[model samples]
Target: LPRPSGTYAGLPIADYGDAPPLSTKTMFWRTSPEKLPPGAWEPAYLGSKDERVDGPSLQQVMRDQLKPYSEPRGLLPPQEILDAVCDAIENRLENTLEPQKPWTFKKACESLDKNTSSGYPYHKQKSKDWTGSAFIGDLGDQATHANNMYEMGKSMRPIYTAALKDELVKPDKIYGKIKKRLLWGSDLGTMIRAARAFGPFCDALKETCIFNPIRVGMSMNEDGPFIFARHANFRYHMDADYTRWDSTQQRAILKRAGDIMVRLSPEPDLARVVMDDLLAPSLLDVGDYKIVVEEGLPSGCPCTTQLNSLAHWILTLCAMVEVTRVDPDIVMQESEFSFYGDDEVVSTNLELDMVKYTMALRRYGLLPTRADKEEGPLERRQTLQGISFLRRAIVGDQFGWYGRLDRASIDRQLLWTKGPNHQNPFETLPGQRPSQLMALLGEAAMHGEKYYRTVASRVSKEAVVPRHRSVLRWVRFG
Candidate 1:
């Protein structure tokens, strides 16, 4: 049986089985402008330009509203602690104790606990102590206690001070441990949220254009999408007025608005791209980079669209605009146009390495301290990397194929072109051929199926390898 000719053309539609109507029990309705409340006072008249006096400037208004709240407060142990910590970390690169050892190893451990009684006491009278007595143990017990103490000391040795050869251990070792533990804690997250809550209130005084006719049309709900499109267009033009203001004034107004927008709508996908591209790569070397690169698939692929958008906007608006328009003398400037490159730039191989490194770290608990060393002598590292790689590949293949099929179905069902030529409403515009559509669908499906099968095969190969090598290594180490 042949399907009707017009049946497949147009937007895809579906119907849910009969559902109950929604209730609007608390809804309120107002049909006329006169139903609104009256203002507190009426204006005498619309003042003429010559007769009008300028109201308080936006800056003046902001200062009046916010100056009292802007008083500087002390951040203890003051800014000096951050400076000192940074200096210490830099000095520690070659040796753990190059900079002055702030305290004895024992004292440093005690200092980590800030409680007055638990930490050091300056006064003897104020000191708190626990008194206890125990019978002396025999030689065996003594030997065990000695071993325990040795292990404890070994763990604490990273912060220990010594007179000579002190510079051998990096000073940054202590500061890095401290910074990682303290600054990156959950408390910092709380502080940032609290600090950023004050932004939206300050943007109230900023001047913005309000087109009376457009706004009236919008209020009437006349072509809502068109209204929004016009609003977006108008916003671009209005941006120029803000840009022409003094740099300081412009920044003061716009910075807070930007923060508010970000706070209201967090863009995790966009953020991930920046983190992966600009920040994550530089954090490790070639080998670790391999792990990160290989693992980049599922993580990077899901957010690809958002990442592309963010990168494009940043490049076009910030970097390329300046070079193309303002800086005529500079004939050429490099932009991050290509998504693939060699090791020094952006390379797929390097990206693969990063993926492998990321997988290795997560699976093996092996933190890559230096890139030059071979992958590992440790069995756990190998086992972990292998497992992670397989898992990632399997998941990547499944989703990749699923996405392609879904896209193909959507492309096949949707009409590509609709214009005034055909009297029959369902007929597509002239020159819109089904071959182009089929080509796109075929390409999408082919890539999806290829990657899926390749990854699946790779996973199967690794899974079958004998564990004897890993097992032997573990036994030898033990």
Candidate 2:
């Protein structure tokens, strides 16, 4: 049965009981007016058209308890929606940190070491992997533009450590370590409850997208802090693409992160310094021109930066769509939604809810790519993180959500047709084919051994020793 048509106000305050039954009906296929505020699509948040930026100074006002909760002024959503969002905000503030512990220099070093080290395996494996963008410009036939993570970590350690220390600057406040406990990202418990709904089988579905932050050599400034691109002169690499971040638009995303920190941090003043020193100050060097990173975190900061920034963003969205919970329960019916990083799996089953989520994202300068249902008909599929699956009848009188390896995409990668003559590079590169086959077979096993054997039988035709060596071959004999 469908949820009652109209806006979701959550359960009644006085007599709240069990959660409403989770709707079996997929909200993705809804075709009716969404129950949402009339101005849900309005652009009133910071960095949007109206441009209501928060002040940079930490001297503004301490917005703690008596502050209760506040909404973004002139937001497109109505007072009721704002009230719901405020409730979620209050819950986060009360639970997460009244006096958020400061991230010290030692902590910062540890974070840098851990993050860089964590990226080593991926970087080592895919450092020279073939992709469409691998061969472009002067290095037209190059496999990839990636650095050795091990060397990167070593090179950055001393530089990053030196930046953390200042002989003349007030070291007292910068390194004050406080009693610390494990701090969960805002709205993490809510997201966890939603994620646990996935069965034991396809655990990878739990991770829809991966957003990792890196660090570089850059420090604070008085006239609005900003950092320069590490690879200043390179143009034909993967990072040059603006469409990736849709970062072309100059928005105050970092500032908003700082604002939330001030509002929630126990030490608001330190929060201000953290933003100035760590998050902001980035400059991207384009081939012909230079683009200043006005919005988003500096390309490589700590995961803490991305986690803190995105947590608040997700909570705000939860408040908007009234997604109080994601688990399937019969006590009270909330919206259907799950998010891991920027990738979201939402089906409010109400057009209004969809519209509200979209508008709120835009109001905050976020680009909801591949979410336009009006542009074309949407495929009837469910995805978590990056893995896609389907719900179908398994046996007579029984049904199950079946997940399979997305072989089509991998196959397409194997047969790249966009280049001149539609050349398939993997066909000639035996080294690359095994990695692709390995991923396909790995997912096949994860889904079902039967499918794994089937894929293995087909893929077993070719095998090679997995020996890694750097062979210098001259294309043109000099």
Candidate 3:
């Protein structure tokens, strides 16, 4: 049999009177754009060589438009409304005699455990904490797998205690002189904040449709790699990231407080308590002496009291809600616009994407980073949420685009699984455990498995299969 000609699965049958046997295969024919109907060849967003190319730069376009919000303290609402919201929050929290209920406590503890465990195991990344090593590596002591696991249990102790005891209190505030040096694990303060916000945050998450299930980090309902189920034209997808929007902490807190008020209108006290604690100066130990974080969201992982991710999520929702408020059209009118975490994607066209939505985000202080905008036409291939979308063909000759696992994403996953230099800690055939290899394989398996398999084939000429086989065998038969 002649090797298949096209990349897509399925072979085309000749248009004979006698039809061929029906098989579980899809056939596609490569066709030219001219062959399709008029206006069929529009760009992913809008195919205009002039509009796509000659328009003002995204940065310049953003600079030209003034912020739509008039109140001007931050993007969401006025300072007075924000103050009222906080006031309501404080009044509600301070006066409430009874904690809400068991479900609330259960959900809150679960959320904290999920968030903290989901975060970095060791403060390996560049964090505000004294370097990853100094935090983990100590008195000639090093962090190992077992040590990290034991440390994780210690982190969970406060969360379990709070849930079991059904009270949210500061650990240091209660237990004097037992200053728990901050580790990458959960602190008592974080648990309190988590319990305070979890119920409200969850309610808000359920109601939010603006947070399209575009990315892995943000969504509450969905948790996995990006699945390309919608077979719509993805010709114009913009994958943009926010540049240090979290550092704009003060205004974001107000915006977050306002958002909380909207979501948790009933429990104003919880909102107020979360807001005050967020703003309050928290202590951090550098070496012998401890310092106070006068303002700003705590930057690093070791700040046991900090709820950075929760704050970040609220801020994200706040930004999205404000965008909906002022320019309802950009968000409501277009089905393609999606805001997940700090990343934004618009699949419609350049006008709404670069000129309208991007500018609106800038107005609200969700500024786009300087990295993506290069001095060139928008490329045919765009990567969003680790999936690369090709502009032209979907299956074979289909005009719409198709998504596949991004090569860069795959490489990065492989690098992460392989760890530091592709060299395993034990100089063994399979460096990682079966579960780790399984995770990497699972990520690569999403979207187009065939494409990933082909990439792997190119890599043994790679181990995707071999790598897994080795690890599984090592674990099972060792």
Number of the top-ranking candidate, with lDDT as the measure: 3
lDDT of 3 by residue, 1-478 (tens): 4322221111122111111111111111112112323222111111112132234322222222111111133354444533443453334333432333322433433343322222222222213222423222321122233223222322221111000111112323222321111121223334434344434534433343323322323331132112233313344445445554443444456445445432443445554444444345433322112233343334322211223433333343333334344232333223344333334444543233244434444555554653456533222234333332221112221322223334455553343222222111112223124565454454454334565465455444323364544533332222
Ranking according to lDDT, highest score first: 3, 2, 1
In order of appearance, the predictions have TM-scores of 0.16, 0.38, 0.44
Q: Where is model 2 more than 4 Å wrong at Cα?
A: 1-87, 93-107, 113-254, 261-268, 277-282, 287-291, 296-298, 304-333, 347-373, 376-404, 410-439, 446-451, 464-478
What tens digits encode model 2's per-residue C-alpha lDDT throughout 112-220?
2221211111221122332322323322221112112111221111001000110111212212311111111111111111112111111121121111111111111
Clashes within 3 Å, all models in order: 33, 22, 10
The superposed Cα distance between candidate 3 and the true structure at residue 438, in angstroms, equals: 4.1
Query: Best candidate per TM-score, number?
Result: 3
Q: For model 2, where is the 10-residue window of minimal lDDT?
A: 158-167
Put down candidate 1 lDDT per residue, 1-478, tens digits, no spaces. Answer: 3321211111111211111111111111111122213221111111111122224322222223222112222111123322332232222221221122112223212222122111011111111221122112232232234234332322110000001010111223222221001000111111112112211111111111021111111111123223223332221110000110111111211222223223222232322222223212111111101111111111111122222222222222222223223221121122111111000011011112333323332232113222334543212111111111100110122212111233323322232232332222223333333453433333233344554344334333322221333422332222
Location of the lowest summed lDDT over 10 successive residues in candidate 1: 157-166
Better of 1 and 2 by TM-score: 2
Error of 1 at 287 (Å): 26
For model 2, state the Cα shift of residue 36 in Å: 48
Which segments of model 1 are wrong by more than 4 Å? 1-316, 326-454, 458-478
